Each structure stands twice: as structure tokens, then as C-alpha cells.
Amino acid sequence: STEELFNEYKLTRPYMARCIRCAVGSCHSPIAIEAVKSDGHDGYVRLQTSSQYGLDSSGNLKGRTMRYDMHGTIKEIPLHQVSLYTSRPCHIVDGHGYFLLARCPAGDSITMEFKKDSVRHSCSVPYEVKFNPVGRELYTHPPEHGVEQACQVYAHDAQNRGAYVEMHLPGSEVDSSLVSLSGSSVTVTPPDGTSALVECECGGTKISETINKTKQFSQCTKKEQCRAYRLQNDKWVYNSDKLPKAAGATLKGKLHVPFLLA
Amino acid sequence: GLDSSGNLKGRTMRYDMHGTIKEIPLHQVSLYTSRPCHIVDGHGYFLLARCPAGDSITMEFKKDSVRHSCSVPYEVKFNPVGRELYTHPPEHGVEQACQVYAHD
Amino acid sequence: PGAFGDIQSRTVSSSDLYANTNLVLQRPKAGAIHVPYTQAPSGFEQWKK
Amino acid sequence: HYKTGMDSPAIKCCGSQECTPTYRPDEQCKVFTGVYPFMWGGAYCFCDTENTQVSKAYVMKSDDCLADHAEAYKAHTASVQAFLNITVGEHSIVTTVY
Amino acid sequence: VELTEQGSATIHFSTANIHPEFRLQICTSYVTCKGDCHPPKDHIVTHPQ
Amino acid sequence: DGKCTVPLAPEPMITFGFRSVSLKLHPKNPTYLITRQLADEPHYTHELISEP
Amino acid sequence: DKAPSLKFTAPFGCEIYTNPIRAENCAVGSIPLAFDIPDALFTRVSETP
Amino acid sequence: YEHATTMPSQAGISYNTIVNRAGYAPLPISITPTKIKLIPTVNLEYVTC
Ligand SMILES: *[C@@H]1O[C@H](CO)[C@@H](O)[C@H](O)[C@H]1NC(C)=O
Ligand SMILES: *[C@@H]1O[C@H](CO)[C@@H](O)[C@H](O)[C@H]1NC(C)=O
């Protein structure tokens, strides 16, 4: 169990990605759904999510835990606290990496939900989920008995097969909460023990990167006048299209896809 | 939108119970159609929600141990915009003029 | 595009891949970081149907 | 089944970018100008316009192509074979005969 | 069309005649202009004739 | 009134022939194809297409 | 049961717009023009090449 | 535009032709066969030593 998770979670960094329908309007969800694969037969789907499964916020193996990024802070929830449904409630089978194996009915969309502190985080995406019967009898719910036939299903194993996805260097993510305002002066206080690239345009242009503790850029009057991008770039992230790209050579390894069709 | 006494609150449903007036936060109030709905806001007697298509609509909450539910057979419609018939709004496309129940 | 063999590989393990799916990139929605694309639905799934 | 892969958008604030030559299956690249990206931590660029976003996409095989694939053959010159019990004069043999 | 003391002038014209022969009028002159035309590449275009 | 995002159907595959246009259509959602001649008799067609 | 609007079912390629209700670029008919040109613009044969 | 020709099977000798549309610039075409391979479908019967 530990050998599978080496490259997946020694270097993990779950991310926050845009969701078009997140419990009110569209926002940036911690559980944004990237892909839903439903090519198996007996209603088994393999989701790819921005959150991560099977370990805690520190990076050590845990039984059934969904781990999500919240405004830069990596947090945890039990996997039984997460709900999934296409048209009727789904039943999560397991989770591994960015991927989640669930048993879903057919539906025109898929929705993932959970409530952590007081608010309900949801993400619904319009990815059609298909139920594919096996054989020459078009059932909708698998029978209690019959005859065994060969079929392709998304297996409940997370071993390293031949399928991989890429991990990349995360791009700098702007955080406007760092930029506070002292008396007529912007002030950037990066997160404790972390750098911050303050790209600041007012009278005189400023690209001060190496700030670590606190800086006061008195040349600039209002907070909204310039940005303070957050730099960690120590844990690498999936090559999502809902994240900015980091300049230079970005590829850093391969993540094996679990729950492959078997 | 405001509590039993008559003072403004953030997201609160006020309901009559056998003559005495009670309150409950809106996140304990749920409603659904064929699939679950999502409440956007509430004001006065009116509630703005985001519902999928269905032949009826049900509204539930739970106060102490009794579930208060009310289901009515009022058809709920989903109206695609444009000339492509979708059942769930797309993640991307082109901006077209439509009419929606504004959140104000 | 949209028909059997829209993507083709000489063998399963071959590094070559001929793809013709009418992949077209669209303009991103205002204030959103994503890559909107449009392409013909998979021809293998359509053939299976 | 194919999988449409795609790189993270490359965003430049008060700048312009150029398309990298295509080297992957069905790769498409476009530099959309006048974008105002808006991350979870507020707006990404302090720059109202002349911001560029490079978005590119391409096609790969799905992760399940090892098992869920159909292979196309060309067939010709059939070779007939038979499995026979031959019995001649109380001498018996079960064999495959081309 | 601009005109000089001596030279050649080019005029772009559109005709439906396979064998055109017209009387091109210039400042005062009436030149008789003839030739042969050939079918075009495109079966369908995006502009009216 | 406001603006909302509507989908964008895959680009049709157009083949030209002598006084003929062949459209190959692969929709993702049930999509409307409307058509009319630019003449005195439009002979407009209006179809809903789900399958290729 | 609306049936398609006039912008989709109008003859002669008309484009229907509202506010005000109008039809644009109808390829029908012909506009007769009457010109009254002052002699100032005209030039004698000697002046022109 | 569909063109058809017949190049003799002879390695190392170029074959130059031209495509002449009715009213467009001629298109030169050249085919140079460096090797022509004929590979029969062989199945092993047995091996002797
Ligand atoms: C032919 O071979 C099969 C396989 O051993 C056997 O079952 C069958 O009885 C044979 N028939 C005769 C006539 O020997
Ligand atoms: C007309 O449609 C048929 C099939 O309905 C198709 O085979 C043919 O190619 C089409 N015509 C042209 C000019 O492509």
C-alpha cells in the first residue's frame, strides 16, 4: 500500500479549481471534478478530482480520507463524509491519488458534496454517466442471479499498471489576502515561512520576489493596485487546465492511474 | 431572511407551528425535485433555488425528531438557451441573452 | 472524426498516434482560467453504440 | 476511446505570447488576447487588457486502451484445419489434419 | 485608374463569359479587349457573384 | 435579462460539390440545424439532430 | 410551438432585427437614383489626359 | 482536384510530371523511388540441420 503512494503523495499538492456549479453560482471549489470515466459495465465510474484520497494533510497514509486544498491550507475529511450522485446517490468504493472509484447510476451530470465546518462545498459537472449492461438482456440494475459472462469493469485495485498521468511544477497562485493596508501604504505579509512575489505597479515598478517575513511598499496607495503571488513550488501538482502554468521546464514525473479497466 | 422576533438575520426561515412562531437556519432546510435542489436565497414568502427538471417539488426540514415535509405536483421545467438542447449548463460556450430569476 | 478509427495507433504499445477529431479551441470565459475546446464525440464509442 | 489532454494555460500580464509549433496528435494552440484571469485569491493580473493566455490541446489514448480497444485486421487466404478420429483396420488415431 | 505618359495599366474585372470580348472605355479611347477564361477552382464560395 | 453561457456544437465537416454542400454533423447535445435558400422561395428546413 | 422566427424563415436573405423592427440587406428589387451634378465637377476634354 | 499517373517500377530513376489546371499555375510533381520491396507472407514449416 505504501509503495503505490510514493510518487503520488510524497509530492502531492492538492489544488483548488474552477467549478461551474458549486452550491451557489460558479466558484473555485476544492473538489472540482476534472474527468468522469464510465466505460465499464456494471455502473462503476472513475472520477478524477482536484482533491486527493488516502492520506492526511501531513502526507502519511490514512485509511479512507479525502484531502483537499482550501485557500492554500491542506485539510482532511473522512471519505464517508463525502457524497456523490448522478441522478440517484452513488456509493464510493475507494479513492487513490486524484482518482476516486465509485458505483454510480446513469445520469446527465455528476455532483460531489461535503460539509466541513459550517458551509456545504459542492461541485456539479455536466459529464454524462453511462450504465452499460453485459450481454443480450438490457437491465438497468444488476441482477441477483443468472449466468456469469465476461465483462470489463473498473477494478478495485490501485496497483501500478501501464497508465500514467503527469505531475508538473505548480504555477504561482495569487492571494489578495496577503496585501493589507497600513496608513496609506500597502503591506505584504507572506504566510509564515513562505515566500511571495509581489508584482506591484504604481509610481515605479516593483517585482520584489524574495520577501519572507513582512514588507511595506509605501509607494503604492491602495490594496487593489497590485498583486502578491504565493510561491511554494515544493509539492508538484497535476497538469490541470484550470491552473496557471509555471514558466520553464515543468514536467516532474508520472502518476500511475489506479482503478484501471480490467 | 429574518428571525421569529422580527429582526434581520442572514439566512433564516421563519415558520408558524400551531400558533407559535419559530425559526430555523436555511442550511437545515432542504428541497428537491427528481434530483436535489440548491437554495440560492430567500426573502419574505419567496425562495430562490436552483432546481433540475421534475414533475413535483418537495421541501423538508427536521426540527427535533419530526421531519416536516411538503410535496406538491407542480411541474419544474429546465429551459435551455439557444438551439442546443442541454440538460445541465455547459462549462464553456458562447454568451447568449437569456432571462433568469435574478438574485436580488 | 466521429467515426471508428478517428484515432489510430499501429500497435497497442506503439508511440505513434494518428488523431483526427476536429479538436477546436474556443475563447475562455471572462474571468476564468480554463481551456475550452470543441471536438467530435469519440468514434469508438459511437461505433460501439 | 481518446483522451483530450491539454496543458495549463500560460498567462502573461501586460504582455504577448507566441504559439509553440505543434508536435503532438491533433495539437491545437491559440493565444487569446484581452483576458482577465480571476483565481481563487482574487484577480490574477493587475492589468485590465493586453493580457494574453496561451491554451493548447492534443489527443492521446485513454488510460484503458490496454484492455478496452478494438484491433483492425486484414484477412485473406483461409487455412482449413480438422480434428479427426481415423480408424483403419482396428488401428485408431486422433489427430489434427491440415 | 491612374494614367502616365507611357506604359501599361492593369485593370481587375469579373466576367461570366467563357470567351469574353468587350469594349473597355478609358478617358477617351475605346479599346477592344478579348481573351479566354477558364473554370475556377472552388465549387462553392462565400460571396455573391 | 442577462447573459448566460450556451454550448457550441462541433464544427460541421463541409464537402463542396457542383451546386451541392454535404454537411457531416456530430452533435454532443440535440442540436438544431436551420437552413434556408437566399431566394424568393427560402424552402427553409428546421431539424433537430441527436445522432451523427 | 413557435416555429422558427423570421430571421430563419425570411426570403431574399433578409436579416430581421428589433428595436426598431426592421429587415436588413434584402436582396430584392433595385434602387433608382436621380443625379443632379453641377458643372463645376466636370472638366473639359483638353484638361483631361 | 484528382490527378492520376503511372510511374514505372524502377528504383533510382525519377519520375517528373506536371498538373495543368485550365487557368492556374502549373504544379510540378516528382516521385523518386529509392527502394521497392516485395515481402511475401511466409510461415515456417520446419527446420532442418
Ligand atoms: C472421436 O474423438 C473424441 C475425442 O476423444 C471422442 O469423444 C469420440 O468418442 C471419438 N469418436 C470415435 C468414433 O472414436
Ligand atoms: C449525399 O449523401 C450521401 C449519403 O446520404 C453521401 O454518400 C454523399 O457523399 C452525399 N453527397 C456528396 C456530394 O457528398
Question: What is the distance between the alpha carbons of residues A204 and E25, in angstroms, rounded to a whole number?
Answer: 66
- Measure CA A221 to chain center: 36
Question: What is the distance between the alpha carbons of residues C28 and A17, in angstroms, rounded to a whole number?
Answer: 15
Take atom 10 of ligand 2 and give the residue whose Cα is closest.
F22
Question: What is the distance between the alpha carbons of residues D24 and G45, in angstroms, rounded to a whole number?
Answer: 68
Backbone φ, ψ for residue G6 (5° rounding): -70, -30
Helix/strand/coil for A206: strand
CA pseudo-torsion sign C31, C32, C33, C37: negative
Take atom 12 of ligand 1 and give the residue whose Cα is closest.
D85
Residues of F in contact with B78 (CB under 8 A): none
Residues of C in contact with D9 (CB under 8 A): 28, 33-35
H6 residue type, one letter: T
- Beta-bridged to residue A215, according to DSSP, are A188
- Measure CA B35 to chain center: 13
Burial class (CB in 10 A: 0-12, 13-18, 19+), A97: buried
- Which residue does chain C place closest to D42, by CA atoms? C31
- Which residue does chain B place closest to F33, by CA atoms? B83
Resolution, angstroms, 1 dp:
4.0
Residue count of chain C: 49
B31 residue type, one letter: L
Q: How many CB atoms lie within 10 A of CB E42?
A: 8
Technique used: cryo-EM
CA-wise closest residue to A172 among D51, D11, D29? D11
Ligand 2, pocket-test mutation among F19, F20, F22, F25, most atoms within 8 A of CB: F22
Question: What is the distance between the alpha carbons of residues C43 and B15, in angstroms, rounded to a whole number?
Answer: 55
Q: Which three cell numbers mark F25?
A: 454533423
Helix/strand/coil for D40: coil
Residue E41 and residue H21: Cβ atoms within 8 Å? Answer: yes
Burial class (CB in 10 A: 0-12, 13-18, 19+), B9: middle
CA-wise closest residue to A171 among A260, A94, A104, A237? A237
Contacts of C11 (CB under 8 A, 6+ apart): none
- Beta-bridged to residue G44, according to DSSP, are none
Q: How many CB atoms lie within 10 A of CB A232?
A: 14
Q: Distance from B103 to chain C by nearest Cα, in Å? A: 20
Backbone φ, ψ for residue A79 (5° rounding): -70, -20
Expressed in angstroms, the distance from the first to the final Cα of chain E is 23
Question: What is the distance between the alpha carbons of residues E26 and E37, in angstroms, rounded to a whole number?
Answer: 22
Helix/strand/coil for A98: strand
Question: What is the distance between the alpha carbons of residues A111 and D4, in angstroms, rounded to a whole number?
Answer: 22
Beta carbon of D39 within 6 Å of any ligand 1 atom: no
Residue A127: C-alpha distances to residues A28, G41, H47 (Å): 18, 70, 58
Please give the distance, rounded to the nearest whole angstrom, from the Cα atom of residue A149 to the centre of ligand 1: 29
Inter-residue contact A19 to A32 (CB < 8 Å): yes
CA-wise closest residue to B81 among F37, F7, A153? F7
CA-wise closest residue to D6 among D52, D56, D53, D63? D56
Question: What is the distance between the alpha carbons of residues B31 and B47, in angstroms, rounded to a whole number?
Answer: 11
CA pseudo-torsion sign A231, A237, A243, A245: positive
Question: What is the distance between the alpha carbons of residues C33 and C28, in angstroms, rounded to a whole number?
Answer: 7
Expressed in angstroms, the distance from the first to the final Cα of chain H is 58
Beta carbon of D95 within 6 Å of any ligand 1 atom: no
- Beta-bridged to residue A202, according to DSSP, are A204
Pocket of ligand 2 (CB under 6 A): F 15, 17, 20, 22
Inter-residue contact A261 to D68 (CB < 8 Å): yes
Cell 437556519 found at: B25
Please give the distance, rounded to the nearest whole angstrom, from the Cα atom of residue F16 to the centre of ligand 2: 10
Inter-residue contact A188 to A195 (CB < 8 Å): no
CA pseudo-torsion sign C42, C44, C46, C49: negative
Strand ranges (E), chain A? 17-19, 27-29, 33-37, 44-55, 61-70, 73-78, 83-85, 91-103, 110-115, 120-125, 164-168, 173-174, 179-182, 185-188, 195-202, 204-206, 215-217, 226-231, 237-238, 251-256
C13 close to F (CB below 8 A): no
Residues of E in contact with G45 (CB under 8 A): 28
A181 residue type, one letter: L
Backbone φ, ψ for residue H33 (5° rounding): -80, 115
DSSP labels, A39-77: -SSSSEEEEEEEEEEEE-TTS-EEEEEEEEEETTEEEEE
Q: Which three cell numbers mark D56?
A: 493548447
Pick from H1, H3, H21 the residue to mutate for testing the E interface (most E CBs within 10 Å).
H21
Q: What are chain H's partners, defined as 3 or more CB pairs within 8 angstroms?
A: E
Residue A221: C-alpha distances to residues B55, B76, C10, D46, G43 (Å): 56, 51, 62, 14, 68
Beta carbon of D96 within 6 Å of any ligand 1 atom: no
Residue A152: C-alpha distances to residues A80, A157, A221, D69, F2 (Å): 27, 14, 62, 11, 46
Question: What is the distance between the alpha carbons of residues A57 and B74, in angstroms, rounded to a whole number?
Answer: 46
CA-wise closest residue to D24 among D5, D2, D1? D5
Inter-residue contact H37 to H12 (CB < 8 Å): no
- Measure CA D2 to chain center: 4
Ligand 2 atom having least distance to the Cα of F15: 14
Contacts of C49 (CB under 8 A, 6+ apart): none
Q: Which three cell numbers mark A60?
A: 502519511
**Half-sphere exposure of residue D8, counting CA atoms within 13 Å on the CB side?**
26
Which letter does DSSP use for residue F12 in this model? P
- Measure CA G48 to chain center: 33
Q: Which three cell numbers mark D6?
A: 491539454
Residues of A in contact with B88 (CB under 8 A): 21, 108-109, 124-126
Question: What is the distance between the alpha carbons of residues C3 and C20, in angstroms, rounded to a whole number?
Answer: 10
E44 close to F (CB below 8 A): yes
What count of CB pairs under 8 Å joins E to F? Answer: 8
Buried (b) or exposed (e) across A190-227, using 16+ Cβ within 10 A? Answer: beeeebbbbbbbeeeeeeeeebeeebebeebeebeebb
Regarding the domain delimited by B1-104, which CATH topology (the fold level of the hierarchy) does it fall under? Immunoglobulin-like (2.60.40)
Take atom 3 of ligand 1 and give the residue whose Cα is closest.
D85
Ligand 2 atom having least distance to the Cα of F20: 13
Residue C48: C-alpha distances to residues A43, A86, C5 (Å): 17, 23, 12
Pick from A108, A118, A129, A242 the residue to mutate for testing the B interface (most B CBs within 10 Å).
A108
Backbone φ, ψ for residue A173 (5° rounding): -105, 120
Q: How many CB atoms lie within 10 A of CB D36?
A: 18
Inter-residue contact C21 to C1 (CB < 8 Å): yes
Take atom 8 of ligand 2 and give the residue whose Cα is closest.
F22
Regarding the domain delimited by A5-171+255-262, which CATH topology (the fold level of the hierarchy) does it fall under? Immunoglobulin-like (2.60.40)
Residue E28 and residue G27: Cβ atoms within 8 Å? Answer: no
Q: Distance from B54 to chain F by nearest Cα, in Å? A: 20
Q: What are chain C's partners, defined as 3 or more CB pairs within 8 angstroms?
A: A, B, D, F
What's the CA angle centered on B3, arms B1 and B4, to 5 degrees?
135
Inter-residue contact A31 to A112 (CB < 8 Å): yes
Q: Which three cell numbers mark H25?
A: 499555375
Inter-residue contact A169 to A233 (CB < 8 Å): yes
Q: Distance from F3 to chain E by nearest Cα, in Å? A: 30
Inter-residue contact A238 to A255 (CB < 8 Å): yes
D21 residue type, one letter: P
Q: Distance from F48 to chain C by nearest Cα, in Å? A: 17
Query: Is the backbone of residue G9 left (phi > 0), alpha (psi -120 to 50) or beta?
Result: alpha
Residue B89 and residue A20: Cβ atoms within 8 Å? Answer: yes
Ligand 1 atom having least distance to the Cα of D94: 2
- Beta-bridged to residue A61, according to DSSP, are A55
Burial class (CB in 10 A: 0-12, 13-18, 19+), G42: exposed
Residue A196: C-alpha distances to residues A172, A178, A188, A209 (Å): 9, 9, 8, 6
Beta carbon of D94 within 6 Å of any ligand 1 atom: yes
Which letter does DSSP use for residue D44 in this model? S
**Half-sphere exposure of residue G41, counting CA atoms within 13 Å on the CB side?**
3
Question: What is the distance between the alpha carbons of residues C4 and D72, in angstroms, rounded to a whole number?
Answer: 10
